[PDB]
Amino acid sequence: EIQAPASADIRVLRGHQLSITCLVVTPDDSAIFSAAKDCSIIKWSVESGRKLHVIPRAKPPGHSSHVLCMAISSDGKYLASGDRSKLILIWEAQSCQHLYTFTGHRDAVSGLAFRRGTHQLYSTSHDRSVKVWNVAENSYVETLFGHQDAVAALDALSRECCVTAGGRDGTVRVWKIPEESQLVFYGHQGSIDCIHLINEEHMVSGADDGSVALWGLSKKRPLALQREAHGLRGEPGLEQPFWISSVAALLNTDLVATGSHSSCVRLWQCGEGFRQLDLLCDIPLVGFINSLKFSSSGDFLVAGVGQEHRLGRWWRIKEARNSVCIIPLR
Template sequence: MSSFFIKSKEKGKNTAVAKRKHDGDKMRAKKPNSKYNEEISSDSETESPIQAKKRQSNQDVEYEETPQEKKLRLAKLYLEQLKEDEENKAEEESFETDLVAGRLQEEVLEQKGKLQRLIAKDIIPPDPSEIRLLRGHKLPITCLVISSDEKFIFSAAKDCSIIKWDVESGKKLHTIPGGRKGTEDRHVGHTAHILCMAISSDGKYLATGDMNNLIMIWEAQTCKHLYKFTGHKGPVSGLSFRKGTHDLYSASHDRSVKVWNVDENAYVETLFGHQDAITGLDSLSRECCVTAGGRDRTVRVWKIAEESQLVFHGHEGSIDCIQLINEEHMITGADDGSVSLWSVNKKKPLSTVKQAHGCHGDAGLEQPHWVASVAALQNSDAVASGASGCSHNSQVQLWKCGQNYRGLQPLFSVPVSGFVNSLKFSSSGQFLVAGVGQEHRLGRWWRLKEAKNGIYIIPLKRKPPTPEETKITK
């Protein structure tokens, strides 16, 4: 009996263990692996054949890919990445090549004097509230220059003083006071009306010329006096540094042009040809300069190396101002009220606008407003002129040069009060600076008491690009 019960007990135990094992196997068979059960959908959702196929494909790649296949797949991805990188690099190199080629082409055109950036059409008239007036000189402004980095303006006046201005703040940074006549031996600065000034392209030197036949050289950064050049026998009326050098050209009422080496503090040579007082001078990179001959009514191009000159005729009055646009084109203004465009290859103007700033006086006795100053945005089609006349009609006129400088079209005018004795564009064309006074820079024919002696900073904004232009740019 006992053996029966023992045997029966062991049998029941084995049967229970077997049952639990069997149930466990069933549970494991029913329960899916957790790796395959990361997402659980509701009973109402059914898996589409595409999703099932995609899932199966992912499972096959992830769990059935052999090491060799994985290496091959990664190698293909790496090669595709290399190919894409090479294509991007080729595109960048092509873009850079085109950019460099464009710049080289511009440099070649600039050296030939044929570069003309068409920007005048995009310049819009400034809001009167945006025009700033800087005041500091007691007497009329006669000349001014802008540093190549556009941070500073230097101005000079009939009070014999020189002021260095900060463009952004409009504050005076330094003043070189003028002295009285007879104090030349003990006064550092000028003691007579300053008629002209120039700054070197690297911003190192500032040169100023006065009615006492003197040329002063200053350190532009500190306004420290460096040299005094003597030699002219009449008032110094024009100064210009050759671009990229410290060679200085000067013009005078003694009808001569002189060449100086500022680095060596040395005189080089003198050129003669004009038959009357020279009233203006300008130069760029070439070893030559251009001058306006006042009452002899000629414009001259001086070829320094060849020791020769070209003579041009066109204005009917005294040519009082001149400015180079590029190496082969220039603009002039005269007291007959006309503004002319010239090419160094033609002896007559390419284009002339008579009575460019209108007339004044009674009916039948009208007189054109004198053109006292001109300016050009280098290598572009934008130029400007400044008038002298009645205070209510004084203005700065912006012009657009035609294709190949074959015409002048008025853009807009900016009213100012007084004689516009000097005009300069900033190198980027972001603003235009006008030096204004109660009297003409070269004399005292009449005086406008209500005018203010100061500097006008005129912003030159551009039109936003049209959608078509934006698409083209992109």
């Protein structure tokens, strides 16, 4: 089994001045990039917890508005960061040198993923579009349409395909790019706010009604759905579920992680055929869990925490720390 980590195990990296919005772990597991509502990007050493580089709020390169999303290529070469200025900035991940700025989105960039094994980048946006870029050639390829509202998130693995979470449109969409085809799955579970691939044929999503869903990429209804996955607050009969702010999966395994603002990160195991989600443990962690990523090794989980939700200022948890938390999974 996995030993349930406690506060005495969790390394809390401090330095962002406002809520963390997103992060990535480098493929080699040696570093973390995080971004926050302070508009900066920080590169951290996993091993020491020290800062390796800081890209400040921005004619030096950098972001003038919140970074909402980031992705790193599978060879570790490129970092992409997407912001509320409609921009995707591309960086040399080793040096943090700015390489390019992709323009073309008409509203905030809200999801990014590289196609594994390539330098092909997929983005999505509040402008309701999905875009395809080639980072090696600094080129724009094409735009795909279908979502009916601002898109919340995007993931991809090795196939020429991405999956998106439609937010208030209530859909998860599968974009089969060379096939010029689009599969639309209906969640019937409020706003679909986060998504992550588990393997090439399965994914996990989280919704603002508190539900966590497992999907097969070719079946139109969830294979599993865990209601109120982070529990409840409120009066008897009038309960309000904790909304799901982040989800992560450990590639090619049955391990999934979920985050809300319920004071814990939850680890789950997917049952045979992905037809059931079973809770493994609660990891104590106060605040908005705005980002979750497993290490490549699966030996640690990284959480991006904020006093506030990554998308707005509606709620503040004053007891939380705006931190990048390294959670060991032993």
